[PDB]
mmCIF file of C-alpha atoms in Angstrom:
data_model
loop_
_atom_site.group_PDB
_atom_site.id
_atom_site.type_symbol
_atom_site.label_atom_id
_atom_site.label_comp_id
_atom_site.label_asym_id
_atom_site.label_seq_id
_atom_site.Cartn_x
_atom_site.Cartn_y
_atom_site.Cartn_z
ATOM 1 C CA UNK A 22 68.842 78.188 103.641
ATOM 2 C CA UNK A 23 71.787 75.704 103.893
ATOM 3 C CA UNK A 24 71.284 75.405 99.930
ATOM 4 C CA UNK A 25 72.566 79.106 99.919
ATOM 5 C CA UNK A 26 75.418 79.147 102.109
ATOM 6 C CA UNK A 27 76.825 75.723 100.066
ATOM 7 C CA UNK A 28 76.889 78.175 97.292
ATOM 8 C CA UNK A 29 78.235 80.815 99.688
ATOM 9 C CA UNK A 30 81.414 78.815 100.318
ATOM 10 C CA UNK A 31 81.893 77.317 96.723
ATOM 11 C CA UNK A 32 82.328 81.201 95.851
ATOM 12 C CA UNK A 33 84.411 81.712 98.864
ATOM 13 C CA UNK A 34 86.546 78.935 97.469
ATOM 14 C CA UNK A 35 86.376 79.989 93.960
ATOM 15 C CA UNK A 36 87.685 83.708 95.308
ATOM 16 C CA UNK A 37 90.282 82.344 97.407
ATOM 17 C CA UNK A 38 91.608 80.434 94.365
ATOM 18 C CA UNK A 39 91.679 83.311 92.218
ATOM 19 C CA UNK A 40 93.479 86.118 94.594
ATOM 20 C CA UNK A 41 96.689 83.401 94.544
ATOM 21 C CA UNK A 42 95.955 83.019 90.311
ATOM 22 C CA UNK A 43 95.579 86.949 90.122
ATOM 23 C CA UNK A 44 99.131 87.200 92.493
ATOM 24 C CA UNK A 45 100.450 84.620 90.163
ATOM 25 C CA UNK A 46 99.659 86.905 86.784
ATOM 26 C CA UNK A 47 100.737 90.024 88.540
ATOM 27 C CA UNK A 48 104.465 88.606 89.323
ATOM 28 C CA UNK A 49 104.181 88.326 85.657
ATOM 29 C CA UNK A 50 104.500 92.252 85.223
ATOM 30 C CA UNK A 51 107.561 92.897 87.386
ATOM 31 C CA UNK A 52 107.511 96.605 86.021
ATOM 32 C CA UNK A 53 104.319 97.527 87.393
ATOM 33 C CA UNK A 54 102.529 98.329 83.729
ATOM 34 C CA UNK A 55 99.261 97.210 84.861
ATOM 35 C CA UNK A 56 98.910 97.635 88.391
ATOM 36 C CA UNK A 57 96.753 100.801 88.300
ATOM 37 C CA UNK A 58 94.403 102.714 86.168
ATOM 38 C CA UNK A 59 95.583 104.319 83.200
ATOM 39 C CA UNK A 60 95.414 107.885 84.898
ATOM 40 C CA UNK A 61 93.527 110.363 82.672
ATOM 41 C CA UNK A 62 95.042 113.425 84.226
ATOM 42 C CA UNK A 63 97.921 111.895 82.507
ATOM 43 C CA UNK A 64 96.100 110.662 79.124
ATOM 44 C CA UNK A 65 92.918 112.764 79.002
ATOM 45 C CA UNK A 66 92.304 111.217 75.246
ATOM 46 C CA UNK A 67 91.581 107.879 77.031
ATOM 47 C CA UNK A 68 88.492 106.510 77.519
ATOM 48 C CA UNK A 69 88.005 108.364 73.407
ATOM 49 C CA UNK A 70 90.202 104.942 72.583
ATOM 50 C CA UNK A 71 89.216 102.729 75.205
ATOM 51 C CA UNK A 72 86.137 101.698 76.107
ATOM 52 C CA UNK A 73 86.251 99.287 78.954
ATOM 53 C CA UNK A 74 89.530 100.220 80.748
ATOM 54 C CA UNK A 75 90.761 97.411 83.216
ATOM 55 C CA UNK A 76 94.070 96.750 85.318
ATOM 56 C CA UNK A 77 95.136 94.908 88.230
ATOM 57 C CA UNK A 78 93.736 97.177 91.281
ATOM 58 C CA UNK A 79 90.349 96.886 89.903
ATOM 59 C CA UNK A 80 90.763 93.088 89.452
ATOM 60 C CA UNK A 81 91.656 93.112 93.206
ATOM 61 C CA UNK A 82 88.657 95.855 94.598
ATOM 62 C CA UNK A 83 86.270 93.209 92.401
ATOM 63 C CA UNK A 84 87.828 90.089 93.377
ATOM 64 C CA UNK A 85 87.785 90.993 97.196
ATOM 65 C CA UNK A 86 83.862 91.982 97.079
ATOM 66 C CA UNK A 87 83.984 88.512 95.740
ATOM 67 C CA UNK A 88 82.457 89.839 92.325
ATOM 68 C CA UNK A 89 83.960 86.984 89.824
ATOM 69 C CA UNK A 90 81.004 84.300 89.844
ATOM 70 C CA UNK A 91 83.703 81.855 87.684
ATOM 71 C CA UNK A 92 86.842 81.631 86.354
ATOM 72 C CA UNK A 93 85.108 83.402 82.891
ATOM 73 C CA UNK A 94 84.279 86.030 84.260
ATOM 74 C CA UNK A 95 88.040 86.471 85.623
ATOM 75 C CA UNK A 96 90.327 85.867 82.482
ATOM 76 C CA UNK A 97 87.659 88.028 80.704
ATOM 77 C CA UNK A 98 88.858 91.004 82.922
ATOM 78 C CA UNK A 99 92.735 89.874 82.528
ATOM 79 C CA UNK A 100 92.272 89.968 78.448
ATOM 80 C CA UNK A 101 91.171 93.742 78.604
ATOM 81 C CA UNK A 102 94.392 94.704 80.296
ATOM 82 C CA UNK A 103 96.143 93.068 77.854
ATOM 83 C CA UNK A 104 93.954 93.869 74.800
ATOM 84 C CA UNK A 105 93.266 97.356 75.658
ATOM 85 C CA UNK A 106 97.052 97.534 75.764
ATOM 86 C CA UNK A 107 97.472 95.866 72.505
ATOM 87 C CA UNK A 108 95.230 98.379 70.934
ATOM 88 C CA UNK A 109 96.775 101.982 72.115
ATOM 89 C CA UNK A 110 99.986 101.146 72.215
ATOM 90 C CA UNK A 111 102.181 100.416 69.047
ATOM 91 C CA UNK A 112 104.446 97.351 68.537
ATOM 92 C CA UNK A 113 107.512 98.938 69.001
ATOM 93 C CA UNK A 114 106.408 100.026 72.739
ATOM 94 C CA UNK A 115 107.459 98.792 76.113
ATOM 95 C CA UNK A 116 103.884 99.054 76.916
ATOM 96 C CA UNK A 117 103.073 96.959 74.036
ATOM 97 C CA UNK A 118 105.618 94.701 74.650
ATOM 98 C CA UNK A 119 104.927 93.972 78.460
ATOM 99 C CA UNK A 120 101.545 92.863 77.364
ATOM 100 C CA UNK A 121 102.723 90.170 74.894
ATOM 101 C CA UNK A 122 104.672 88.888 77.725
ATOM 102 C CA UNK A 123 101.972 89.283 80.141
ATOM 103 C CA UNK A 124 99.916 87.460 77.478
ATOM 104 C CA UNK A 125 102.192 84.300 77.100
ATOM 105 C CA UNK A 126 103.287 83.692 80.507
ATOM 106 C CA UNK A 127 99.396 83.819 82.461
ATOM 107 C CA UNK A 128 98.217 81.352 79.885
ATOM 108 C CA UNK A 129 100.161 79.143 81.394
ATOM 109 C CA UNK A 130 98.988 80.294 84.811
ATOM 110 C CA UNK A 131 95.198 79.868 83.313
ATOM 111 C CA UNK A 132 96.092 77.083 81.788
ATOM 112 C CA UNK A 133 96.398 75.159 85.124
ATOM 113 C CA UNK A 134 93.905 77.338 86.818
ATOM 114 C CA UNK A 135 91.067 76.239 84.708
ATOM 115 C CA UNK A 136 91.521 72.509 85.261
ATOM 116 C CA UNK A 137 91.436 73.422 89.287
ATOM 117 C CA UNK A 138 88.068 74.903 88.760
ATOM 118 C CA UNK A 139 87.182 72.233 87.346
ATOM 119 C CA UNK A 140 89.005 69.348 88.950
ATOM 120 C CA UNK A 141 87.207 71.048 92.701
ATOM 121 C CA UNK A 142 84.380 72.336 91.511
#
């Protein structure tokens, strides 16, 4: 139907927006912290702490099947980086640390990005 393909290319548009907001956030973690999976060859104790793990290459594998129906759906996925983060690493971490600053500067990024969802629909 042409109703379908409308919808078709409003979530082609919606996934084209959020690849340059999810480029955007990553700049925002120059080190690298979240670009992967936490490995558990390297912390086998993990998913015992963590339930939902998330990071920035399975942001991109979803976001290129175009898997986020909105914006929600989205900045859910970026707040489990940064909360699962928050919640195995202690204060006084780098780790920690990177994800308060992650934290501060995308909600700016979001910020803006949610009134373009809006704003075009």
């Amino acid at each position: 139907s042409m109703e379908q393909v409308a919808m078709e290319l409003r979530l082609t548009e919606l996934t084209r927006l959020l690849r340059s907001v999810l480029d955007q956030l990553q700049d925002k973690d120059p080190a690298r912290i979240f670009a992967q999976p936490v490995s558990l060859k390297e912390v086998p104790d993990y998913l015992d702490h963590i339930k939902h793990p998330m990071d920035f290459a399975t942001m991109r594998k979803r976001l290129e099947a175009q898997g986020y129906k909105n914006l929600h759906e989205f900045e859910e996925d970026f707040d489990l980086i940064i909360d699962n983060c928050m919640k195995y690493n202690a204060r006084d971490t780098v780790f920690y640390r990177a994800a308060v600053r992650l934290r501060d500067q995308g909600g700016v990024v979001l910020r803006q990005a949610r009134r373009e969802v809006d704003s075009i629909g």
